Write a protein that binds this ligand. Structure first.
Ligand SMILES: Nc1nc2ncc(CO)nc2c(=O)[nH]1
Ligand SMILES: Nc1nc2ncc(CO)nc2c(=O)[nH]1
Ligand SMILES: [Cl-]
Ligand SMILES: [Cl-]
Lengths: 267, 267
């Protein structure tokens, strides 16, 4: 029996900041209602055009939300999106069990150790830039699969050297602008995702209505749900163990079909 | 450059039968608007519980609709779903360029010759039953891929013997109840669809909200669009050249993503 994918539901937190906390719990409950396995909280955007926020601002955004979710939804599994060691440290103390670092441990030399001194998992994503805030850039590649594979191999090596065992390391190839503002490279990584299973780590991907799904029609975000379903399903077909998404209900259901296709006949 | 899938939009025609014809043209135009490449007309259901209709009743349903579409939408490519030679013959005379036979040429010994004496393509579908009206039956298989492959090999041989060249033969493994009321076999055929490319024919499949997509939640038809998108996308990933669907807009868009994943890098 092949296990289904774990669905990671996005809960972004980016005078009146207390109005967000009650609404965050309502949103988290809806994500769980739709079948999310993990609620992913983040207080700092890192897409193109984003700017750096301080650790104090980042904590001020996510800590009230973590506390409220831990109190009202106590069995909910929490992940926190951060590249800052101080933020990861507080998140882990409050009960988060996953840290997702879009810098793959590069932005803060202390973050690996913080996670090493926990029982949390870390997600290491490939990005074409050193700055966790990714750029608009039509980066080309001779062989994006080789580039990303070797990058993730090296980041896994670094995470293990800092004390994180392989079984708490999750790898993400990146998709969309993190890989390139040219969409072809995201499709190539999805095509060859099974090659990354040789690194011995669970795989996490996030098609999530990214602009590489705009296609020939130049589809805006509201029109990218069919493409997000198709990409997330093929990612699972090709070895994804986690899918991060805003559309938990539909992507869970589409991924269940991928799992069923991967299921070998009766033995 | 890998070609995109051809989307086959379903237009079913199953006191006041003249009210259907004007509405059929409106529906056909919408299917084309959404990006269908072929409009598939049929006057006889063949799912579980369906009953046989006469050739005269079948023609009385589809001929006014074909004529109206040929007149109002003259560049639209028309396929007709029929297992009857007489019906196929009239459809071809009126300008249909595809005959889809859910009996794979078994139900009417004259149908192969009718298509041979045309420039139309024929779709040969596998079904577990000889009767084109398929049964409710949880048919089990030792190796459904072997069964279906050998069946389609033999039907291709028969079609060629009757005068239809390979390049006008399209093969469909069947899905849903045509294969089995047990869903596992539909998923297995999707998993192994590329094995059928050895038969040297274009491949046609129709996930189209069939009950094998009901999943663990026992989803009704209204809730099967994410699963239809995922299944149709993986079918294209695995070699489908045609996808037959009611949800042309969404399935076209999901399949475009599958095509992009199949697209090799710059050479
Ligand atoms: N691991 C991971 N994290 C992300 N965080 C933000 C965004 C924003 O688009 N994408 C991703 C992603 O693709 N993978
Ligand atoms: N070739 C083909 N024809 C069909 N006709 C009707 C239906 C009705 O569900 N399905 C199919 C199908 O899966 N393939
Ligand atoms: Cl610590
Ligand atoms: Cl004839």
């Amino acid at each position: 029996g092949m296990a289904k994918v774990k669905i990671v539901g996005i809960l972004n937190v980016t005078g009146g900041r207390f109005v967000e906390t009650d609404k965050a719990v309502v949103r988290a409950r809806e994500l769980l209602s739709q079948g999310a396995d993990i609620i992913e909280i983040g207080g700092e955007s890192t897409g193109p055009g984003s700017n750096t926020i301080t650790a104090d601002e980042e904590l001020a955004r996510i800590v009230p939300v973590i506390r409220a979710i831990r109190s009202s939804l106590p069995d909910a599994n929490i992940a926190v999106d951060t590249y800052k060691a101080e933020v990861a440290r507080k998140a882990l103390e409050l009960g988060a069990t996953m840290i997702n670092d879009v810098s793959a441990g590069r932005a803060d030399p202390k973050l690996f150790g913080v996670v090493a001194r926990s029982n949390a998992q870390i997600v290491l994503m490939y990005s074409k830039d050193t700055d966790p805030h990714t750029s608009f850039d039509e980066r080309q590649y001779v062989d994006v699969v080789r580039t990303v594979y070797d990058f993730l191999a090296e980041r896994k090596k670094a995470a293990m050297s800092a004390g994180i065992p392989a079984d708490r390391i999750i790898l993400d190839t990146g998709l969309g602008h993190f890989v390139s503002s040219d969409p072809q490279y995201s499709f190539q990584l999805l095509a060859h995702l099974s090659d990354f299973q040789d690194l011995g780590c669970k795989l996490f991907l996030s098609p999530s209505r990214k602009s590489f799904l705009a296609g020939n029609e130049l589809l805006k975000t509201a029109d990218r749900l069919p493409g997000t379903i198709a990409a997330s399903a093929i990612a699972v077909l090709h070895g994804a163990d986690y899918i991060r998404t805003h559309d938990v209900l539909e992507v869970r259901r589409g991924c269940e079909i991928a799992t069923a296709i991967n299921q070998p006949p009766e033995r």
